[PDB]
Amino acid sequence: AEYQNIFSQVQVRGPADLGMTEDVNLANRSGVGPFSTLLGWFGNAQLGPIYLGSLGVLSLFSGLMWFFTIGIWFWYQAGWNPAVFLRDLFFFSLEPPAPEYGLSFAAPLKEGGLWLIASFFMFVAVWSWWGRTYLRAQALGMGKHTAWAFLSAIWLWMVLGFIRPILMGSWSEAVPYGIFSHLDWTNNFSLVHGNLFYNPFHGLSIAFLYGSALLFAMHGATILAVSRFGGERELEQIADRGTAAERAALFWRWTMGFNATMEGIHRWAIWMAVLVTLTGGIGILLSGTVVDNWYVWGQNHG
Amino acid sequence: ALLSFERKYRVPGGTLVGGNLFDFWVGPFYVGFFGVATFFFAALGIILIAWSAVLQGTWNPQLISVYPPALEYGLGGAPLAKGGLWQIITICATGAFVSWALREVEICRKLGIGYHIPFAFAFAILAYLTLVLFRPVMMGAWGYAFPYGIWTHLDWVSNTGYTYGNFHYNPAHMIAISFFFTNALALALHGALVLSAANPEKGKEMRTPDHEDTFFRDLVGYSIGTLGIHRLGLLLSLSAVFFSALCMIITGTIWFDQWVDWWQWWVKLPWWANIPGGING
Amino acid sequence: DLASLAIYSFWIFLAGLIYYLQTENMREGYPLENEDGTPAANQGPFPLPKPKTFILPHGRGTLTVPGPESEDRPIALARTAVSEGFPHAPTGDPMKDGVGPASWVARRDLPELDGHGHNKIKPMKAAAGFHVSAGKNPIGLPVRGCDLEIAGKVVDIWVDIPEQMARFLEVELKDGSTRLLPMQMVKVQSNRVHVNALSSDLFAGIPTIKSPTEVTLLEEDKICGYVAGGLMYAAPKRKS
Numbered sequence: 001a002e003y004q005n006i007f008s009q010v011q012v013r014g015p016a017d018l019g020m021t022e023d024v025n026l027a028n029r030s031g032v033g034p035f036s037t038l039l040g041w042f043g044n045a046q047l048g049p050i051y052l053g054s055l056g057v058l059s060l061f062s063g064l065m066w067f068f069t070i071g072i073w074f075w076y077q078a079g080w081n082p083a084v085f086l087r088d089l090f091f092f093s094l095e096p097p098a099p100e101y102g103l104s105f106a107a108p109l110k111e112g113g114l115w116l117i118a119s120f121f122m123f124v125a126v127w128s129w130w131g132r133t134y135l136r137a138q139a140l141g142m143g144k145h146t147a148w149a150f151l152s153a154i155w156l157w158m159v160l161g162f163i164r165p166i167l168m169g170s171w172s173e174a175v176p177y178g179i180f181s182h183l184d185w186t187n188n189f190s191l192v193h194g195n196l197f198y199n200p201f202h203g204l205s206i207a208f209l210y211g212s213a214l215l216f217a218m219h220g221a222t223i224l225a226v227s228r229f230g231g232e233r234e235l236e237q238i239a240d241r242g243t244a245a246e247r248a249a250l251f252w253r254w255t256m257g258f259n260a261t262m263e264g265i266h267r268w269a270i271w272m273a274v275l276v277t278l279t280g281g282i283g284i285l286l287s288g289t290v291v292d293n294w295y296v297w298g299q300n301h302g
Numbered sequence: 303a304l305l306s307f308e309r310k311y312r313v314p315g316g317t318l319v320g321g322n323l324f325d326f327w328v329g330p331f332y333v334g335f336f337g338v339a340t341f342f343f344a345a346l347g348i349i350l351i352a353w354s355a356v357l358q359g360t361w362n363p364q365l366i367s368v369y370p371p372a373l374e375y376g377l378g379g380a381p382l383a384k385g386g387l388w389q390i391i392t393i394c395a396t397g398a399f400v401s402w403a404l405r406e407v408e409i410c411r412k413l414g415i416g417y418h419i420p421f422a423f424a425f426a427i428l429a430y431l432t433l434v435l436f437r438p439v440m441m442g443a444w445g446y447a448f449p450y451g452i453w454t455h456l457d458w459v460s461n462t463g464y465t466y467g468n469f470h471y472n473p474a475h476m477i478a479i480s481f482f483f484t485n486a487l488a489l490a491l492h493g494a495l496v497l498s499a500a501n502p503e504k505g506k507e508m509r510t511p512d513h514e515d516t517f518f519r520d521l522v523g524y525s526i527g528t529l530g531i532h533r534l535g536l537l538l539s540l541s542a543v544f545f546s547a548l549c550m551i552i553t554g555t556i557w558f559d560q561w562v563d564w565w566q567w568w569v570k571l572p573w574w575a576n577i578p579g580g581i582n583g
Numbered sequence: 584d585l586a587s588l589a590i591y592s593f594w595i596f597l598a599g600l601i602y603y604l605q606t607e608n609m610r611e612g613y614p615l616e617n618e619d620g621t622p623a624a625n626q627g628p629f630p631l632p633k634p635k636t637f638i639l640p641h642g643r644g645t646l647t648v649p650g651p652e653s654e655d656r657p658i659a660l661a662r663t664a665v666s667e668g669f670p671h672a673p674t675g676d677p678m679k680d681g682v683g684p685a686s687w688v689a690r691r692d693l694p695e696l697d698g699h700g701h702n703k704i705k706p707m708k709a710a711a712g713f714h715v716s717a718g719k720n721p722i723g724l725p726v727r728g729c730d731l732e733i734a735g736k737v738v739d740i741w742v743d744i745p746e747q748m749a750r751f752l753e754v755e756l757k758d759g760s761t762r763l764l765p766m767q768m769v770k771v772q773s774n775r776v777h778v779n780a781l782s783s784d785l786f787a788g789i790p791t792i793k794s795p796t797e798v799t800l801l802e803e804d805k806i807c808g809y810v811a812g813g814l815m816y817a818a819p820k821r822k823s
């Protein structure tokens with residue numbers, strides 16, 4: 001059996017890697033976590049450091065507040081009973097205000113107000129975390145590709161919980177906080193809009209979701225197949241093409257008649273992925289605001 | 303017809319069948335025995351689909367649909383116009399996909415690379431075969447397979463799902479979806495990371511993999527690393543497809559009721575089944 | 584209708600995006616060539632993109648792509664047919680000449696450097712304070728080739744400092760000199776390291792390095808290509 005490079009045969013360790021300085025405020029970096037021999041079979045053993053900073057603290061605190069606001073409501077729904085809590089964990093649901101309250105914040109705690117509070121904490125948690133992806137790249141002198149890609153996910157999120165609700169005229173349109181209940185919301189959204197399979201944007205979203213798996217299967221497999229020539233050192237192969245990048249390209253050229261470069265594949269990658277939530281967000285944003293029934297729309301072809 | 307670095311790699315050898323018989327290219331395309339097999343299977347398949355379109359009486363690509371034999375035929379042959387064409391097109395498709403993978407193996411051998419790509423592709427083939435061969439055989443009829451039509455294949459997904467209530471409640475479906483979402487998230491991040499290092503702020507030097515480790519550790523306190531991420535993306539996307547095939551091989555065979563009710567086993571556990579309060583008491 | 588406007592617009596955007604992405608991926612290997620090295624008549628419908636320039640760290644220059652392409656090395660191959668699209672047979676020993684699966688690229692004859700400008704890859708003995716942390720330590724093991732003979736013994740591991748990973752095994756041969764073997768091409772076992780790619784007699788022919796404590800990108804390509812090439816070219820002396 002030829003060795004396949006899925007798991008490492010031998011792990012090596014040296015001094016904890018504290019990373020590149022550039023313009024990072026080092027006062028804001030933790031120390032190293034433990035080293036996981038377990039992780040080290042597949043990826044990196046080292047844990048940490050992490051970067052704190054005010055935004056990071058805000059984001060994390062705000063994210064926990066969101067999580068705890070949902071848990072508190074869940075405990076209350078369980079009548080404070082530990083055994084009912086665990087039994088019914090996936091059945092609990094923090095639900096948005098009823099249609100009658102419209103977009104007002106005048107709904108009572110137990111009937112929508114707590115949903116708004118949780119949502120508020122999620123809103124600042126996510127956006128402050130976005131600002132974080134930008135600033136961590138900035139301090140390192142890197143491009144802003146991560147923050148830009150992250151904005152595509154944020155787009156779908158924002159459409160589901162904020163933009164579409166505001167446009168529809170009520171918070172009742174937003175997604176509930178619950179395991180099973182978010183799924184029921186999802187099924188019901190489709191049913192009420194005449195079947196999302198007739199939404200051309202849902203269909204594009206799928207093409208890209210499937211597409212992402214095809215592509216990362218392709219890319220990942222390719223790099224591993226040429227890791228015997230240092231293929232995974234992608235940046236030095238961009239700067240100085242080696243036989244890894246050439247065999248990679250030629251595999252695909254011989255197979256399907258065209259190919260990528262070591263840099264360009266990563267451009268196919270980022271776009272295949274961000275287009276999932278980009279088309280997605282549009283498909284959802286248009287639903288109910290402009291198109292009531294996707295089947296109906298599709299019959300007029302538009 | 304050749305990339306600037308290509309000629310040194312176009313040596314003889316690596317074929318699985320035929321020696322030097324088909325050891326050649328057509329433009330960029332490698333051929334080999336399995337390039338010939340792929341062409342045969344694909345061409346026959348497309349011819350038969352076109353024949354099916356004539357018998358259906360349309361050339362509209364949004365209307366052409368090739369249906370498997372009705373349930374009453376079970377697992378035997380059907381008249382061409384009533385599911386037999388579907389049967390032959392399925393043999394052709396399988397022929398073509400497997401041929402494609404094997405041609406990929408020939409290309410790997412010529413290029414002296416690992417077999418990872420055709421290995422990964424085999425997962426996709428297996429998922430296809432689950433839907434058109436394994437599950438229908440286990441369920442006793444070809445008619446449970448999906449039809450070959452752009453819109454009709456979507457009717458099938460819908461009707462099949464709702465046969466079990468909200469299909470969201472299939473627990474293997476849930477894992478599958480999680481791998482799909484996680485894969486797309488990792489693709490976005492890998493692509494963004496490499497690009498953010500290769501294309502830094504205006505005027506700055508290319509960043510290093512060290513910068514890539516630094517950025518992710520700064521962000522989340524961990525970095526899988528550069529071999530890790532390509533291992534990751536391969537694992538996530540193959541796992542998504544494995545659990546996709548699992549989620550369906552078990553539907554209509556070992557579980558055939560409403561998937562939502564499967565979750566009752568947890569709630570009906572003796573030690574809390576009967577406690578009042580909550581949603582289920 | 585706003586939704587049909589949106590979908591129509593998306594298809595236009597996507598055509599432009601595919602165009603952009605395809606041209607971005609033509610920054611290497613183009614323009615296309617005939618089997619003799621000259622520009623091919625048919626370049627396809629996509630034009631080359633405007634050049635971009637990467638600033639390389641540590642005063643190593645820049646790279647502008649697309650740019651003039653050349654192999655910058657002799658290719659010991661010759662045609663086997665009178666028309667385009669056939670294989671090119673090696674004129675000598677394809678392992679020695681670096682062709683086919685034994686191919687290498689003429690990368691810079693300097694070592695890859697980390698973000699601090701230190702050599703990326705070092706022998707573990709010179710890397711403070713790196714040690715094997717899990718799995719069987721290969722150092723000390725006899726190295727076996729696909730002909731089931733001992734070719735040498737592992738005397739060190741070459742490690743990637745910033746990424747804390749094993750990249751090569753340094754193997755000492757009968758004559759006291761060493762070669763680097765790619766980590767991805769060895770099987771570490773309890774009583775040996777096994778190398779399927781090479782028979783024992785092909786170990787002496789592995790491209791050597793010129794400084795014994797570093798390896799250049801160029802040296803890496805020659806070593807990795809040579810070892811991979813054995814899969815095809817050592818097949819006769821192998822061996823179920």
Ligand code: BCL
Pocket residue numbers: 197202203204206207208210211214348351430433448452453455456459
């Ligand atoms: C995978 C689980 C379900 C599935 C559920 C869905 C759902 C839900 C959707 C699709 C949609 C897609 N499906 Mg489907 N469909 C499945 C089975 C398949 C199979 C197969 C097994 O052979 C194929 C070829 C297709 C292909 C199709 C495409 C028409 C469309 C875009 C897919 C995509 O971008 O993928 C990602 C891969 C790429 C990006 C590579 C590009 C290759 C594509 C474009 C191949 C097209 C081939 C097609 C025209 C067949 C013609 C063959 C010729 C006769 C040779 N489906 C099974 C039954 N499919 C979407 C749609 O809008 O349909 C109307 C959609 O919403």
Ligand code: BCL
Pocket residue numbers: 122126153154156157160186187188189190195196197201202205206209276277279280281283284459483486
């Ligand atoms: C019965 C159900 C309906 C239907 C209901 C809908 C609905 C409703 C939607 C989709 C949408 C999608 N559907 Mg559908 N779907 C159906 C049929 C399917 C089928 C199929 C039948 O095979 C498939 C493959 C798909 C798949 C898809 C995806 C392409 C798409 C979601 C993309 C995504 O990555 O979202 C996941 C990404 C996000 C949700 C964004 C994440 C945002 C960030 C900011 C989250 C922050 C996280 C943080 C706060 C939590 C921290 C915790 C951690 C531990 C730290 N659908 C049927 C017809 N579908 C979505 C869409 O866009 O459609 C147009 C959508 O709204």
Ligand code: BCL
Pocket residue numbers: 186399426427428429430432433458459460462463464468469470475478479482543545546547549550
């Ligand atoms: C109303 C419908 C139901 C539902 C119905 C079911 C049903 C039924 C199925 C799924 C399955 C899928 N669903 Mg569902 N599910 C729905 C809700 C969703 C939602 C959501 C957000 O609401 C999501 C994300 C998903 C996602 C999932 C995936 C896990 C899975 C599809 C991926 C796959 O099988 O790939 C696997 C990939 C393939 C099958 C493609 C392989 C093709 C290759 C080998 C060959 C093609 C090449 C050639 C033809 C190309 C042409 C040549 C040209 C040159 C290009 N479902 C709703 C609730 N779901 C499917 C599944 O798991 O199947 C295994 C499935 O059958």
Ligand SMILES: CC[C@H]1c2cc3[nH]c4c(c3C)C(=O)[C@H](C(=O)OC)c4c3nc(cc4[nH]c(cc(n2)[C@@H]1C)c(C(C)=O)c4C)[C@@H](C)[C@@H]3CCC(=O)OC/C=C(\C)CCC[C@H](C)CCC[C@H](C)CCCC(C)C
Pocket residue numbers: 059060062063064067125126127129130133146147149150151152153273274275276277483484486487490491494521522
């Ligand atoms: C195509 C778009 C895809 C995508 C891409 C994407 N997602 C994004 C971004 C991008 C590029 C990132 O930059 C960003 C990221 O930082 O990833 C590492 C992220 C991200 N996407 C995430 C998840 C996510 N993305 C989604 C998926 C997708 N994202 C799409 C598939 C989904 C799905 C499929 O539903 C999920 C749930 C996060 C991992 C991260 C955004 C992080 C964030 O917004 O955090 C805000 C809130 C907190 C900081 C805490 C949350 C509360 C927790 C429940 C608390 C429990 C843990 C706690 C941290 C313990 C520590 C406390 C101790 C101090 C005591």
Ligand SMILES: CC[C@H]1c2cc3[nH]c4c(c3C)C(=O)[C@H](C(=O)OC)c4c3nc(cc4[nH]c(cc(n2)[C@@H]1C)c(C(C)=O)c4C)[C@@H](C)[C@@H]3CCC(=O)OC/C=C(\C)CCC[C@H](C)CCC[C@H](C)CCCC(C)C
Pocket residue numbers: 210211213214217218221255256340343344345347348391394395398399402419420422423425426449450451452455539540543
């Ligand atoms: C396993 C993880 C993911 C994956 C992996 C994967 N796919 C891959 C590869 C790998 C690694 C290959 O290397 C191979 C490739 O060459 O990529 C470009 C491939 C491939 N995946 C492809 C498509 C594809 N993969 C799918 C998805 C996935 N592929 C998974 C998500 C999907 C989905 C999600 O539906 C599609 C549609 C092709 C681009 C390519 C294989 C091309 C090929 O086999 O060519 C040979 C045969 C033909 C040229 C056509 C034959 C025509 C038939 C005889 C008749 C058609 C019958 C068909 C059943 C009708 C379908 C009608 C539809 C409307 C339903």
Ligand SMILES: COC(C)(C)C/C=C/C(C)=C/C=C/C(C)=C/C=C/C(C)=C/C=C\C=C(C)\C=C\C=C(/C)CC/C=C(\C)CCC=C(C)C
Pocket residue numbers: 067068070071072074116119120122123157158159160161162175176177178179182
């Ligand atoms: C052990 O017990 C303890 C106490 C520790 C707590 C345990 C926690 C538990 C059990 C809770 C579990 C949490 C769960 C199940 C959460 C899962 C929720 C899901 C699945 C979310 C899915 C959808 C979310 C969306 C789309 C949310 C979108 C939100 C926005 C876009 C924000 C909108 C902003 C609003 C409405 C506020 C407006 C405020 C301004 C700016 C004026």
Ligand SMILES: COC1=C(OC)C(=O)C(C/C=C(\C)CCC=C(C)C)=C(C)C1=O
Pocket residue numbers: 484487488491492493495496511514515518524525526527528529531
């Ligand atoms: C070549 O660079 C790459 C790595 O090496 C430096 C990584 O470390 C990562 C980051 C890996 C993680 C943690 C994946 C995130 C997905 C989940 C499950 C939250 C990326 C994206 C990458 O591209």
Ligand SMILES: CCCCCCCCCCCC[N+](C)(C)[O-]
Pocket residue numbers: 030031032033034047048049050522523524
């Ligand atoms: C998404 C992956 C999450 C990674 C978990 C973060 C681990 C960071 C540990 C750093 C803390 C080190 N410590 C304990 C010494 O302070």
Ligand SMILES: CCCCCCCCCCCC[N+](C)(C)[O-]
Pocket residue numbers: 200201202203204205207208211268271272601
């Ligand atoms: C990164 C770009 C790759 C392009 C992928 C193209 C997929 C096209 C799939 C057709 C979808 C048809 N529909 C119904 C959604 O309109």
Ligand SMILES: CCCCCCCCCCCC[N+](C)(C)[O-]
Pocket residue numbers: 256257258329330627
């Ligand atoms: C949506 C899938 C359609 C298949 C298109 C695949 C593009 C391959 C183009 C290769 C053509 C090669 N060449 C040199 C003849 O131009």
Ligand SMILES: CCCCCCCCCCCC[N+](C)(C)[O-]
Pocket residue numbers: 351363364366367368450451452
């Ligand atoms: C079994 C499916 C029938 C195969 C149809 C051939 C694929 C053509 C792609 C669809 C293009 C639709 N369009 C734009 C021409 O209307």
Ligand SMILES: CCCCCCCCCCCC[N+](C)(C)[O-]
Pocket residue numbers: 257258259601605626627628629
């Ligand atoms: C959605 C993916 C579509 C990609 C198919 C079109 C790109 C292939 C054509 C590239 C031309 C190859 N060539 C002649 C430049 O070598």
Ligand SMILES: [Fe+3]
Pocket residue numbers: 219223234266492496532
């Ligand atoms: Fe990569």
